[PDB]
Amino acid sequence: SPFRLSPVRVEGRLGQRVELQCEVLLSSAAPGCTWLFQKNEPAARPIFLAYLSRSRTKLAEELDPKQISGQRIQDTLYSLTLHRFRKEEEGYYFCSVVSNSVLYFSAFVPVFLPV
């Protein structure tokens, strides 16, 4: 288990704030943590959202920072915030880290509207 996700799953409502946390459990990973998205479909592209580290913060160019944001809370603790949840943000969220040249991906966090 390389990660621990704080909400394992979110049942969203329109306009709600949604916050996700990712804790890295690997003994020595490379610096930083990466948030990624996949839409609920086969052949879904992995979509880069944000890179988070002590010294560097990178939000993907196409995203609006007033809608989605991320933060490095701690050495091994990273968060992602959807500020007012919308239907186009529905899908799977997960984080990523390198350790000894191996890319790791956390479990998927389903973030969906009621039904």
Added chain:
Amino acid sequence: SPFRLSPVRVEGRLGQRVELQCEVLLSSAAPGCTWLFQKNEPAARPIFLAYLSRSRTKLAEELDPKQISGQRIQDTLYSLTLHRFRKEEEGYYFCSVVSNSVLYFSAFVPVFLPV
């Protein structure tokens, strides 16, 4: 266009040797390239298959190097070879590089038997 993929799609037969190729076209990129795999399903997770660089080659611990192997042909050119195409290997294959702290993924290369 972060990558040039030389077979953009494979329609294979069982037992055939399948070689994929990835060229990194970004001008700044971290050392190395990574080959990933994704099963043909919703909520399918990306799987690490190999890390290739000038110095190190790292195959996923569960893979038989006589069934799947990788190779760095030259700078900005990387290869993935499925030695004997079998049903367990059907899905999408792609490459990953970090550049300006962004995680990049090539287009999916679909690799399937005829239906």
